[PDB]
Nucleic acid binder design. Structure first.
Length: 549
RNA sequence: CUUGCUCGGUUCGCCGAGACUCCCCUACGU
DNA sequence: ACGTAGGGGAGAATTGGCCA
DNA sequence: TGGCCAATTC
């Protein structure tokens, strides 16, 4: 049963007035600011808004929240059921911990009676059936400098005769590039794509955004959403690309049926200018599972092999010099036991490893350029303290132990952590009986083994408290300037993309090596966190079982 | 495989390789 | 040591009052 | 009749 609905984002080409000034947005803001600032008794009393016109009108009558002229029942139910659920999300977040305590109780209501942690305003316009997107029609819709395609006529492709375009014209592939072109079904980029003109280290081209914008606008696929007397006009080529890369639609489809793979209830965020569409329940035939927790794997694979008589595995072994050391296998079903035959183990290829090691030199090179400039901008009283702490214990503890009078040359190098040589060199200058001791818990229930301290324990005790004076300057200004640089939010997405690239390569090699469409991924009981998250996400985004053995 | 996004090449005329589960919200935990 | 946790979202078939 | 489009409910 298909139960996953991945998103598809489209751009906005025109709009009557900014989305923040629409009556629906103002009503949503008013309702949210009213609901978030009321107590539990007021929530129980003011919780009879219902799903009827006679009930919504009565609610807006007694509460007195401005209605801003918006009186649509379909679009108001979405606003009010979300807003009260957001309010009743503080209670259950705390109440989840309340039952953890049972397995002074925490309360989400403060002394004033209102929520201490109250939710912010959601800046979204959730569309409904009555404002569903429709193909742009110049006669029936406001006039725009755009061409509306025939809803039933076949949508055009890009440039069919790519090699026949003459010289001196857009899209002309030069002769010397002809011998080595691509042969796979590659996504076709038009000549006005910003990716082909973006500023680069050595691109040596001139980006005239005006001509690219005009050329892109002359060949758009306009669709229109009207709410009340307002409207927005979007570009549907994002939906076309979404249905093309997934293979669910072959070229030669119309605009009436292109919108037919997506739900007619988009979501609009005014700050960016993007409409987020969603596939219907069945467009992408993906059943979203969750990773298996051990003993359920020996039941999952039995049923998986009960359908396909040959299933392929992959043993993702994180934590080596190569991040992904895959180990393939194939399983057969005889009885209650599964029989496997290894096929071989590969490592992640060098080119992808090169991309990883060139990204890893872009994050450690920004965690310096951000953290250092966050440190330099502390107040002088905090800045001097943190600077002193940074250089603290470098030679301070060495000077202290020399003041103690021990021989400061035996533990010179590597400290021989196996033999806890700190205690040895304390014993050297007659400090054997002043050696501080540590308790051990070797016993199953308890244990009193207060004995010579280990080297790690010595390091813990000899080093000072470091930066506990503030703990809210270095740990706060850095995390505040993290969002002040767009490079960080770009690098997080780059890390996720690289992790997904590695996962995709491993999955396709598992399919190829095992010669089976049904495959499974097993993970045992840096890039480690992002790779584990990416490998676990296949059960939720693509349906491939993931096992934590 | 027409928009948008990420990483490379160049003769600058564009083409080689990627991701496609995403949004707000409140705190500071492991 | 660096991002993380946990709350909230992401329809549409049917029906009715309904003027031209 | 019937066409249009908010309102009613799962």
């Amino acid at each position: 049963p298909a139960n996953f609905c991945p998103p598809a984002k489209v751009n906005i080409l025109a709009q009557s007035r900014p989305l923040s000034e629409w009556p629906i947005n103002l009503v949503s803001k008013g309702v949210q600011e009213y609901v978030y600032g009321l107590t539990a008794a007021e929530r129980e009393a003011n919780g009879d808004f219902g799903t009827s016109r006679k009930s919504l009108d009565r609610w807006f009558a007694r509460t007195g929240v401005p209605t801003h002229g918006y009186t649509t029942v379909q679009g108001l139910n979405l606003i009010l059921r979300h807003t009260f659920n957001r309010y009743d999300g503080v209670i259950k977040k705390v109440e989840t911990r309340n039952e953890k305590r049972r397995s002074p109780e925490e309360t989400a209501f403060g002394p004033d009676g209102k929520l201490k942690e109250r939710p912010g305003i959601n800046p979204s316009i959730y569309c409904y059936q009555q404002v569903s997107p429709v193909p742009y029609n110049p006669a029936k819709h406001p006039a725009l400098p755009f061409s509306g395609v025939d809803p039933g006529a076949p949508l055009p492709l890009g440039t069919p005769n790519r090699l026949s375009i003459p010289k001196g014209q857009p899209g002309y592939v030069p002769e010397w590039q002809r011998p080595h072109l691509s042969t796979k079904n590659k996504r076709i980029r038009k000549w006005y794509a910003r990716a082909n003109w973006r500023r680069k280290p050595g691109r040596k081209s001139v980006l005239d955004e005006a001509k690219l914008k005009e050329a892109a606008l002359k060949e758009a696929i306009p669709i229109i959403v009207t709410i009340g007397k307002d409207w927005i006009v979007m570009d549907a080529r994002g939906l076309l690309r979404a249905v093309y890369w997934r293979g669910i639609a072959k070229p030669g489809l119309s605009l009436k049926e292109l919108l037919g793979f997506f739900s007619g209830d988009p979501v609009l965020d005014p700050k960016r200018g993007i409409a987020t569409f969603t596939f219907k329940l069945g467009a992408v035939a993906v059943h979203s599972r969750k990773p298996t927790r051990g003993k359920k794997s020996k039941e999952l694979l039995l049923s998986m092999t009960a359908e396909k008589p040959h299933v392929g595995l992959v043993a993702i072994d994180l934590g080596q010099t190569n991040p992904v050391a895959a180990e393939f296998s194939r399983v057969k079903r005889e009885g209650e036991t599964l029989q496997a035959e290894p096929l071989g183990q590969i490592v992640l290829p060098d080119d992808l490893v090169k991309d990883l090691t060139r990204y890893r030199r872009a994050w450690d090179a920004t965690e310096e350029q951000i953290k250092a400039e966050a440190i330099v901008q502390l107040p002088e009283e905090c800045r001097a303290e943190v600077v002193k702490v940074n250089q603290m214990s470098a030679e301070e503890t060495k000077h202290l132990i020399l003041d103690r009078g021990v021989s400061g040359d035996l533990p010179w190098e590597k400290m021989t952590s196996n033999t806890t040589f700190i205690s040895d060199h304390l014993l050297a200058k007659g400090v054997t009986d002043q050696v501080f001791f540590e308790k051990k818990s070797k016993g199953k229930k308890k244990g009193t083994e207060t004995v010579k301290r280990k080297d790690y324990g010595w390091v813990k005790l000899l080093r000072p408290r470091l930066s506990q004076e503030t703990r809210k300057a270095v740990n706060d200004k850095t995390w505040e300037l993290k969002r002040a640089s767009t490079e960080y939010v770009r690098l997080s997405r780059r890390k996720t993309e690289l992790a997904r690239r590695c996962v995709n390569y491993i999955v396709r090699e598992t399919k190829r090596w095992t010669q089976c469409e049904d495959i499974a991924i097993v993970i045992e009981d840096w890039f480690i966190q992002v790779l584990h998250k990416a490998f676990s996400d296949l059960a939720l985004h693509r349906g491939l079982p993931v096992i934590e053995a």
